[model samples]
Target chain A: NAMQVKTQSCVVAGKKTVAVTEQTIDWNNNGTLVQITRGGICGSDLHYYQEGKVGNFMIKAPMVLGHEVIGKVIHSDSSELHEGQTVAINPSKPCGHCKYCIEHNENQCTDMRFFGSAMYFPHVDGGFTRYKMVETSQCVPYPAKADEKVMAFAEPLAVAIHAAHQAGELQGKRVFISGVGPIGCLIVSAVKTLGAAEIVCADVSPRSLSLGKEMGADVLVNPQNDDMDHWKAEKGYFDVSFEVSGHPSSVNTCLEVTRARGVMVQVGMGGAMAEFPMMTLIGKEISLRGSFRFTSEFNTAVSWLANGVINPLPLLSAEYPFTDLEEALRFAGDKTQAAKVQLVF
Target chain B: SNAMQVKTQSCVVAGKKTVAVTEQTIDWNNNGTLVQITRGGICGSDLHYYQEGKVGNFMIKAPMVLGHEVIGKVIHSDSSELHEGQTVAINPSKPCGHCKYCIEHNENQCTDMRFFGSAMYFPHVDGGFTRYKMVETSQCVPYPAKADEKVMAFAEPLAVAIHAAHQAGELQGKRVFISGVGPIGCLIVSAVKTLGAAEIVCADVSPRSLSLGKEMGADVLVNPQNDDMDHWKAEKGYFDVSFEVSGHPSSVNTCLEVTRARGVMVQVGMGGAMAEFPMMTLIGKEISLRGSFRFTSEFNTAVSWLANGVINPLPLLSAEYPFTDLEEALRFAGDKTQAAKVQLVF
Candidate 1:
């Protein structure tokens, strides 16, 4: 019998509230028992914590709220994974037989069960707890030499890497990222790793832009103080642009900066409707693609992290003990305070 | 010396007007052909210049000839394949052949394009409204002897339709939606039909255009004013491809709404500078919107399709006038309900 673990779950019935309570978990014969060392708070979790919902996905029952996880294997029934090995957990488990999964585009699978997501009625319990049971297949072992604490960023970093794949052929291409949030900063690092020649980042927050510079942004533009005409006169500056800011204006900015027949990937889900430059997009023949959650990129993130391919440590700005998860959530939500706030279990 | 033929011409602005001008003959070189205009159709851009002396930013500083959709008989030719009295459809524009766009096979986007009847330059490039014109051998697309000049008049517009189909890429068995049921829209219906589209739905504000669209092979017809467009988009998204031929903002939105996820939306219409785009819907559906200008390979294909009887555009020819009635033909072309294509014969 596996011992019970202390989990922090969103127990909001009608209002917003998260409570820490003890829960019983069974370590199945086909699964691995994991002792979580760090759990990173993501923007999606902020929605459940603040509004008890994300888009059309509403939290109907109590759900634990961390998916960006770094953990150690405590007990494993699978022979491939051994005890005492630290691994980054891939939170999304897609059905293997669906059309999307069969085509290797698993992120678009209709039947996907992601940890700490309210996409389902009885939500799949996440990795915020001290100890939990996960499918052995979700574990990607990291090297013992790495700063495994930062490996908690593997979930979001996978997303950034997947977005880079969506951009396609980044070699020597000029890139633009409209928002400098955690994912946007990670995208900068990913684009840099893919040999993007020049990268420009735009954001309202100076602090986030500073971090973006550290992450390899060659130019930073603050729309408030800067003149967009300089770029407009030099229209079609970027070969590819990533719109990570959910603001309507940022969408327009991404459209403006991209070249003719360029690709613009929308990564942020801000507002639903926006006044778009339809004529401009039509005249230029731009291809705008929507990048949702990651597909096979989670494993790639682990390999990159294990080797020294990417450094996500600078993005981990603040840390809190498992007892101070509420404080960590607050810090993660505030752009002025921290970039990525992690809970140490 | 050949006697110059004095012809009546349609000049620009205010009321329908015609000017008597003596046609000048061109010397036929070893690589060019001299053609006598037999049929000329009035286009939408002709209306813009006829009514306002401007089409978009290109303004008429000098008096410009109005017709570009033309079929003529070759009176004199220097190429071995083309002989005297051969009927050919003239491709109205030519790229400089050495520009960056031309080098990349995107001749429509060539930096130095000389299109007939366009006021893009200080002195407008003349068109085929007159009795005689000279063109390069490459511009002369010869047709079968049995092909009618009226049916061959559709080659230009059908080229646009074919180009739209090309931009959408391989419409072998895809559901399609066309937002505007004008001449271009109806031609798109014909193009997609021949390209083996599974279904084609056309929407228009004019009942005549909607009926014309159906006549041209549209499977479904919609009137934006009479029908609930939202009801037409009941499945949230169902179309595999959409062609926006109407310059209306609302029609553009409908194209966005009705197209399915990962579908292609080809924008062939030119309207204002900006419109309200359903960004959320576009992002969520991952729809790809592309702009299609003119045609290159599709132009030759259009001529071949017309000559081989693969596409018949005779129903679109509503009226024909003598060369002297060029002004009257313009008047007939103005009535949206009565005319789809009005031609003046010389």
Candidate 2:
């Protein structure tokens, strides 16, 4: 095999523009070598492609775009994974000795080298390439017959799982999920699977809401036209609310809809600044938490996917080859049209 | 011992800015006791009813008696333990003992809560502003002979303070901040101190309340309006817990900014309908802000603390008035700079 291979990346050569360039990189890590099969275009990738930045972590240097990925192992230096084995890749690679990692909170690790993330300078390259090298520990091997498209969703599914975990137990409880995007759909799946008696999904997008119902949401609401007064009148409506839309109004909606002593986990990073109802949060004694990335949830997602517990293929709106990565990115940018767009090698 | 022999006089909220001193009669033949009110401290809620005839959603629909912070002498009792001439602190809460909240010992959140001095019920439940009234034996918390009427009078507000502290949780050797520096703020200082807090910081716009906070054992005082709170909080590296009593939007934001990651902030004050809050910081730091309302076991805890001399309520009592000067004491309670707690004695 050759020591170098071609990779597709979003390189910011100027302001507000990302060029899809072919680059050569050595498969140099002392770990398993995998040939990337499928990669999902995430919201953060869309941001980097469209605006060249996401929050305080802007693209100061060139960076690859995909993080939700699945691959087939071509070579392995370890016994855990073998040649020709298909797997889901958990993109997080936290420093094993950091405080957060030591405390078992790998998601909040200070020195995380997440794939395709521009959170730090000299950005960590992602798995948008034809060939990739990853630690053996990052691979969760799946059956050969597993649907690759469904497997591509493991990363975002882990995010939803982590969020649900933050909300504690949802057994026989009422849950509300705001913003029915891909992540929101996954949350609906997780909440329903966890025995939530009632699941209400709110979003302005009718297409996204329909997809939410298909994922087992019990109620669908368009915040624009739906009557929210009934939810508020009940004082404490849902026992738990997941704010998947990073909009300020959505944040407030979660506060209004959740009951006293409810748990609200913020999953969407829509914007840096948002208007929050502090009085309502205090009055209702709500527990508001920020759900970032996955920790042990990544492995759990793979297991759930293998067992037919969660179906994520419904969220995949479009698929493209490595040659059309830019076009997939463009499609993912329109919130009204695409829920999730994936890239195939 | 006849029920019709006793004459009960009350200071009623007849109308806005009107305190009608009148006589009333009641049936004492019940499962309760008749108490002769000795001392009652005017609370902010009472002042709101006296001034505006309403407090938030509670409006005075008819003549309503106006005080909840009370200490009285039991003149007649049906219970063997509670005898005549015994001084007791009255808990103004009347929660139905069968609800889910009550079953869980969260009586404050009981669905059928009929609190004293509240206008939530029509012909409002008369409060301790009257000279003589019938009260449930459970509501009359008897204290030690050594504890005076003034010390017993602090039971209600101190229960609130203790509830706020309970919400904050385990302040032992931890940095604490109490915003507002009112009567409740000072009581919070006393409670946190008893909990062995390392550093107690108090912030207020009033110099008098700040001084009272200092007297109540606050380690530091900051006039939020005059000082750069952000710099101060940064220097202290944020508090483990914060008590928000100022009711101002800015005060609430200050508490949010000054609490460390995963710290608890207890909101003890009620102000306007809405405030612009910094949601991003709240999510980033993962702070828990809880609203502390009326309490349960905390009231008994406050009584024990007061009886045991673990807390002193004398410094907080700014002035005392005779029954004849009830109107004057109400006027004095409205003066923010002049009083921390104003009392009416009979």
User: Each predicted model: what fraction of the native A–B Cα contacts (within 8 Å) does it retain?
Assistant: 0.46, 0.27
Top-scoring candidate (lDDT): 2
lDDT of 1 by residue, A1-345 (tens): 445444443333322577676776655455888888888888877888777777767888777778898889988887778899988988888888965577686775667788887767678877788887888888889887788666788999898998888787999998999998999999999999999999999999998899899999999999889987766543456889999988878888888878666788888887544455666766566777777778788988888887878787878887888786566667777778888888888
Worst-scoring 10-residue span by lDDT in model 1 chain A: A6-15
Give a tens-digit lDDT track for model 1, residues B258-289: 98666788888888654455666666556677
The 10-residue segment of model 2 chain B with minimum total lDDT is B229-238
Cα TM-score per model: 0.82, 0.86
Cα deviation in Å at residue B10, candidate 1? 4.2
Residue B326 lDDT (model 1): 63
